[PDB]
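User: Hi! Is it possible to get a structure for several chains at once, not just one? Here's what I have:
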Amino acid sequence: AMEMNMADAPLEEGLLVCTRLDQNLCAELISFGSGKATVCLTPKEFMLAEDDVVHAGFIVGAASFAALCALNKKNSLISSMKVNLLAPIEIKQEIYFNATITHTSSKKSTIRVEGEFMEIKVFEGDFEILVFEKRPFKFNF
Amino acid sequence: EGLLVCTRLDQNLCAELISFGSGKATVCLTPKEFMLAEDDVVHAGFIVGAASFAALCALNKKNSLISSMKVNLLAPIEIKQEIYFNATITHTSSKKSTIRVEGEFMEIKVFEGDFEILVF
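Assistant: Yes, the chains can be modeled jointly so their relative placement is included. Here is the combined structure:
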C-alpha cells in the first residue's frame, strides 16, 4: 500500500493484530516485521501492584503485545505462555520487549520474548499463538 | 483489611477481590472495553493480571513478587463475561511458593496457570 511507502506512514499501518489494544495501557509499539517486534513499556502509576513493583499483568501484557506483533497474523491469539519475571520493575523504567518467532506452522507458532532494561535482561518468556479460520473467535471453540 | 498485598493495585483496572484467607483467594474479572485486544478477545495482560492478583492474595505475604508463570488460556474471553479466578497454594517453603489458579466462566474452565511467588 502507498500509505505504507510514504516515509510518514503510521507505524500501525500494516498491523493485522491487536486492533482494539490501547497502547497507553500496554506498551508503545516501536517496530515489527520479518518475524520480530519491539515494544517499549515505561510503567505508569496505574500499573503498580506495590509502591515499587509493577503488576505482572502489565509486564506480561507488554510481552504479549510484542509476541502478537512479531507473528502479525490475522485471526491469531495467544494460547499459552511460560514466562520468567527476572526482576521487579518500577515506575519510570523503560523496558524494551523484543519478540522473535522461534517456531511456526500454518496452525501454531512459538514466539520468544526478552525484556531488557538498559540492555540488561529482566524478562523472558515463550508464547504460543494459534491462528483460526473463523471470527468471532468463540466460533472456533 | 487483613490483606498484606497489592496495596497500590487499582482494582477497577484489574478484577474485584471476592475472598481470601487460608492460602486461597477468589477475584472476579468483569472485562471492560479498555481491556480488549480485539473486538472479540480480552488482552492476555488483563487475563493474566487478574489471575496474578488472585495468586498474590492467596499467599498474602508482604514483600512478595510473582517470579514466573506457566499459563494456558483455554478460550477467548469476551467483554462482560464474568470470570472467577480461584487461587490455591499448592507448594510453599515460605521463601518460594507455587499457586495454582483456575479461571471459570459459568463454571466452565477458561484459564489455568501455575504462579511462582518469591517472598523476601
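The interface with chain A takes residues 5-10, 13-14, 33-41, 43-46, 48-50, 52-53, 56, 65-73, 75-76, 78 of chain B (CB under 8 Å). The longest strand of chain B covers residues 108-119.

User: Great, thank you!
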